[PDB]
Symmetry: C2
Subunit: 147 residues, 2 copies
Amino acid sequence: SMRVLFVCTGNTCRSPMAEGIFNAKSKALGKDWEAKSAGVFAPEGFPASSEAVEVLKKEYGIDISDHRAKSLREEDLKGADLVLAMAFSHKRSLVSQYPEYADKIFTIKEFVGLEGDVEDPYGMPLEVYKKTAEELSGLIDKLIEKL
Amino acid sequence: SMRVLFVCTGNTCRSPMAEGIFNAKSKALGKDWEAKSAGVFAPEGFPASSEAVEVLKKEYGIDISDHRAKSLREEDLKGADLVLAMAFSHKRSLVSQYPEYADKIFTIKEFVGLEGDVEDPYGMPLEVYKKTAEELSGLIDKLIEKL
Ligand code: NA
């Protein structure tokens, strides 16, 4: 009951966005759950997209300036109580990647009651990014309820 | 992150009650947590006390009629993500005998940042059982948010 891990592709948008939203909401709830993020194909040294940094701060007052994209290791699957995919395709690859704990790898929507994918907003204007951030916050509000 | 183990001395009064209303709260909310009980020196086969069964029935609408006293073994501690003792006595007894299980062993009050014990309503008037039920319900409220 400590850590949930969000994983996407480049680890520059969705998963680091969900990460910041989870950690800020949980710290404000006193809940002993923290979040981190990784990517199935992450460009390592890179920061979160400026587009993602802006929306979290402007819409929620959340700062994710310290996010650096990180490739998903087996270890982050070891140190997590739960692994949440940003898309079904992410969930698809995770059963393949690290010799399964498929019992703890879900898509974020399916773990919370719906099916589908989280919109990948990379290269999109700052309205779709707002929808992405907003879609994420809502999904996170029911997840913490379960977590 | 699914199991919490409430620890009594005889697993007849507080632990069945603490387990009872936790689930009832964990039922209302959509929460992936479950409660179990045990006693440090429980006589097996014994039901929860009739006062506990009636104070929980009248006040909160939960039953616990199907509870039976279980003495704590090694099966319950391993399967527990978290184990909460009603009193510091139950906590100490466990940690002295079970070191390095101690990382998940805490007292019901100290886990929610408080101090003290939930006292035994053994043979006490219903009002005492009632008062103990209220404290438990209040403490479990804090518990569920932290979990
Ligand atoms: Na999804």
